[PDB]
Amino acid sequence: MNLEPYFELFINNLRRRVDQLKSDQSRLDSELKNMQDMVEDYRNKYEDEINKRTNAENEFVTIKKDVDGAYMTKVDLQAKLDNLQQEIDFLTALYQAELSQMQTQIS
Amino acid sequence: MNLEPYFELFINNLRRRVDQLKSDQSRLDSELKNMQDMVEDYRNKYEDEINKRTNAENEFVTIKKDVDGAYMTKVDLQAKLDNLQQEIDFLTALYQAELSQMQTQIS
Amino acid sequence: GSDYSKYYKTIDDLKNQILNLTTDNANILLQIDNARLAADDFRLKYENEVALRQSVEADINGLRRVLDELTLTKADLEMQIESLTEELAYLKKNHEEEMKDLRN
Amino acid sequence: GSDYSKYYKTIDDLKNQILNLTTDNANILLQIDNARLAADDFRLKYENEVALRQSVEADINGLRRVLDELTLTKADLEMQIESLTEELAYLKKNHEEEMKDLRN
Numbered sequence A, B: 001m002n003l004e005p006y007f008e009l010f011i012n013n014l015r016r017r018v019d020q021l022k023s024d025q026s027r028l029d030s031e032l033k034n035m036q037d038m039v040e041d042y043r044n045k046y047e048d049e050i051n052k053r054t055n056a057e058n059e060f061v062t063i064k065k066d067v068d069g070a071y072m073t074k075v076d077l078q079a080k081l082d083n084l085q086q087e088i089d090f091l092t093a094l095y096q097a098e099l100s101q102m103q104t105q106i107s
Numbered sequence C, D: 001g002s003d004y005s006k007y008y009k010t011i012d013d014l015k016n017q018i019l020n021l022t023t024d025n026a027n028i029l030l031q032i033d034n035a036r037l038a039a040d041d042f043r044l045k046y047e048n049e050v051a052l053r054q055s056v057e058a059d060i061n062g063l064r065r066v067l068d069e070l071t072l073t074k075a076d077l078e079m080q081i082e083s084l085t086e087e088l089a090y091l092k093k094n095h096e097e098e099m100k101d102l103r104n
Helices: A004-106 B004-106 C002-103 D002-103
Strands: none
Touching: A004 B004, A004 C002, A004 D002, B004 C002, B004 D002, C002 D002
């Protein structure tokens, strides 16, 4: 029969299309494997950085509490010191005045 | 007694310090009220933007699903169409060849 | 003297009033500081939120344009498929009929 | 003819093989796309994380410097308070003793 090569040509075209699509599929498989691998890598990085951040925040909380306490202690100590100095000076002047008062009052 | 004004002076100094510290306290009260008010405002903004973001993410998920489906339908339809065209052409040529085959084969 | 004793009482009352006022004001200042840090922290968190939402929404709009394009394409393809299907069926049956005719 | 029928079978098998391959590859491409968006999304989230951590840690170091300064200051003040306390007590008792002396 005359028409065998018509069929063989059309089959050849279909075969070419199939083979291209199979190659494409292999490429897409590799590409998806690379991408998924990336998703896992960046996911891991993200989570680890969450934990590092959280520990940093907690550490900050602790040290800021310590600082607040230290500032309160410094404030109170400075107030006590200022009171001591002021009272020393006042009592110095006043007491010298008492000595005068006594030497003159005796007369 | 001579030394009343010494005491009155020191008392005056202490009174001045007290009054300054009271004024300072009033200012600090106002300042803390302003700050707390800000903390509430920015907290509210933050939370509302969380909710807006979340709704945006969900909406995105939905529309991306719809797009994926639409792309799959387009792919399949395009494949079916290409098949139809290719088969039409092939059958056209082949059938004309069958007509020739018959007119010559009869002879 | 007695009078001097009274003056002493007032002195000490003012000393303690100072101490109390300094401590209280220090505590208030710490409240202000921590509240500051909290406001700034909430503004950073918020900024991150508007960034994430920015990317999301922009991507959404893009995907709306894509979806419209894909739907229009789908309708078009359905039309074309219909036409080519009718045409193919015609072709097949017509050729077969011609075969019958020439064989008779 | 029979032979032509066999060829037909192969043809249709290839047509369906095409359809299957196109669909499968499309699904894989969608998987790749969504995975892309997920990787990019995780990198944005991560970047935000390193920003927050940046602010936190820097603030920490600053607060370490402050804490050291405050502790050193505290020790210094304690020393000064001690000295001035001894000095005040001396002053008071000495003046009182002098009073006793002059009165005698």
